[PDB]
């Protein structure tokens, strides 16, 4: 049993044998479907450029 170790990061079949959620896993989902404002603040800007 286990004569040779397969890397899950390289072997998709082993990556599926472990971690059943891998098939349903999602990534790179957009969450910026809005006005996307800026939160900087005059006080923060003045402190940043104080000297």
């Amino acid at each position: 049993a286990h004569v040779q170790k397969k890397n899950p990061l390289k072997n998709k079949a082993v990556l599926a044998r472990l971690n059943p959620y891998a098939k349903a896993y999602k990534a790179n989902v957009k969450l910026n479907t809005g006005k996307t404002p800026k939160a900087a603040g005059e006080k923060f800007l003045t402190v940043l450029h104080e000297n």
């Binding site: 006080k43 104080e50 000297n51």
Partner: protein
């Protein structure tokens, strides 16, 4: 030219404290010691009878024997590759209780009280100690606490 006297190299070890010579407080003779008590050995220079060796000064042991004017303390000392049991007969003038024992007793009593309350109210125990935990997020404010910008100071002699 080493000398192996009993009180060799004890010039400061057995010295009384500054402005602490003369009369010895009488509460030491009123302290009660029982077999199994954890005690600290601190030699008093004013009392020469029952004086333990300089090795046992500042050592903590367990009381095993009790006599009229002294007490028996069990100490473990390194004699090479093993510890050896030493039974020292020390007068009560050089013996004081270890406050760690009282702290341990208070901890046990607090644990028992919390356990009884948890049993009565059907709640969790949560009695074991924890190391210093990582700091939680805070909300350090700026109002009336405006940051002060600092710069390294130039080299200026003050002599």
């Amino acid at each position: 030219p080493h000398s192996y006297g009993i009180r060799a190299r004890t010039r400061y070890t057995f010295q009384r404290g500054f402005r602490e010579h003369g009369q010895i407080r009488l509460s030491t003779y009123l302290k009660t010691y029982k077999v199994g008590d954890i005690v600290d050995i601190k030699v008093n220079g004013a009392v020469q009878k029952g004086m333990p060796h300089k090795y046992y000064h500042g050592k903590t042991g367990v009381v095993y024997n009790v006599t009229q004017s002294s007490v028996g303390v069990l100490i473990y000392k390194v004699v090479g590759n093993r510890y050896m049991e030493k039974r020292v007969n020390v007068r009560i003038e050089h013996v004081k209780h270890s406050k760690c024992r009282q702290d341990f007793l208070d901890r046990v009593k607090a644990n028992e009280a919390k356990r009884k309350e948890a049993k009565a109210q059907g709640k969790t125990v949560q009695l074991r100690r924890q190391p210093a935990p990582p700091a939680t997020a805070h909300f350090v404010s700026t109002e009336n606490n405006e940051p002060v910008t600092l710069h390294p100071v130039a080299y200026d002699t003050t002599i």
